[PDB]
Amino acid sequence: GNIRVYCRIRPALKNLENSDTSLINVNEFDDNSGVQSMEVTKIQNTAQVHEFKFDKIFDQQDTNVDVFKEVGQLVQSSLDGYNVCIFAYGQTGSGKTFTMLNPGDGIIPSTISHIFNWINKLKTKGWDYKVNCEFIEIYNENIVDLLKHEIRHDQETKTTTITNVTSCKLESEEMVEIILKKANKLRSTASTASNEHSSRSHSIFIIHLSGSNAKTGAHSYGTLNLVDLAGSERRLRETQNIKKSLSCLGDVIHALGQPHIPFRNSKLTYLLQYSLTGDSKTLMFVNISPSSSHINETLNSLRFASKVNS
Numbered sequence: 001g002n003i004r005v006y007c008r009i010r011p012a013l014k015n016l017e018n019s020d021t022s023l024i025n026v027n028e029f030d031d032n033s034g035v036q037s038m039e040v041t042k043i044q045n046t047a048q049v050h051e052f053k054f055d056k057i058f059d060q061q062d063t064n065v066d067v068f069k070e071v072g073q074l075v076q077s078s079l080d081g082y083n084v085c086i087f088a089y090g091q092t093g094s095g096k097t098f099t100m101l102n103p104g105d106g107i108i109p110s111t112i113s114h115i116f117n118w119i120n121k122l123k124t125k126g127w128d129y130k131v132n133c134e135f136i137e138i139y140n141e142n143i144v145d146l147l148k149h150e151i152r153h154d155q156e157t158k159t160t161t162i163t164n165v166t167s168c169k170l171e172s173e174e175m176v177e178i179i180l181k182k183a184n185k186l187r188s189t190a191s192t193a194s195n196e197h198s199s200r201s202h203s204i205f206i207i208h209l210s211g212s213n214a215k216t217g218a219h220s221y222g223t224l225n226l227v228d229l230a231g232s233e234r235r236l237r238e239t240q241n242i243k244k245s246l247s248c249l250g251d252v253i254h255a256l257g258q259p260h261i262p263f264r265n266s267k268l269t270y271l272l273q274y275s276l277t278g279d280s281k282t283l284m285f286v287n288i289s290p291s292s293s294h295i296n297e298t299l300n301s302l303r304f305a306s307k308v309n310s
């Protein structure tokens, strides 16, 4: 289905960074165009302006709440039976985990709440929805249950399962609480947190929405995959792993946007293939720092993003 790309510039961590030797200029959304443009320039050559176009660009002023205002309609399509993928891409420090897991705010916590509200609002229509989830990480192309792991693709239902991975029902906000509180401490920057490892691995929060209509007899199944990718910044075979996995993902998303998708070329794209094909909806989130000390990695992330939307 639809493939969208959003860029997100996080607030500068003052006293640590500044924009003294670079310039990132974001233009307002243009309806004439349908996209939003931004310009990046390095002080050592202000004549060379790198322009980038996206479906939407969030700046230092956009909060997580602001970000979700553009994500809500996407994730609610899962109640219609659509699969959805939301990827957070960017260098370590750009704000991927904050965007996806910030307590109560992140795309994941917000998505769960939004779905819950929709479930109840749909209850008055004969719909009974059930929600279950899994939280895993892909490190060095191996799957680890964060809550033997083999990927089982069901050509019949066009759904995917992973053997021996914990799955939890989400029928209470209390449950969502323990899980999310757990996910955050695992991936968020905390002194006693393995962010070193988290920066070198992909983390995927999978949510399955199964709805049945007692009277209408209709049924519905949609899966949401919320990915917090490994840092894209420029253990050699391991770095090559991260590098090739991220490059593979780009090839696939790009290919998918085209009018032989290399799904099997990486553990992540192979796992998510059913949620990436068909009328599935994909949202690529490119996180970048506004600071001059990261301008080069920033241009790399923005280049990856431009490819993925061609």
Ligand SMILES: Nc1ncnc2c1ncn2[C@@H]1O[C@H](COP(=O)(O)OP(=O)(O)O)[C@@H](O)[C@H]1O
Pocket: 010, 011, 013, 064, 090, 091, 092, 093, 094, 095, 096, 097, 098, 099, 188, 189, 199, 287
């Ligand atoms: N949108 C944001 N608003 C406020 N702080 C942010 C935002 N994004 C990131 N940060 C902060 O920036 C630092 C980088 O965070 P993080 O999301 O963990 O980066 P990454 O996951 O890309 O390595 C953290 O201290 C985080 O709290």
Ligand SMILES: [Mg+2]
Pocket: 096, 097, 098, 187, 188, 198, 199
């Ligand atoms: Mg992180």
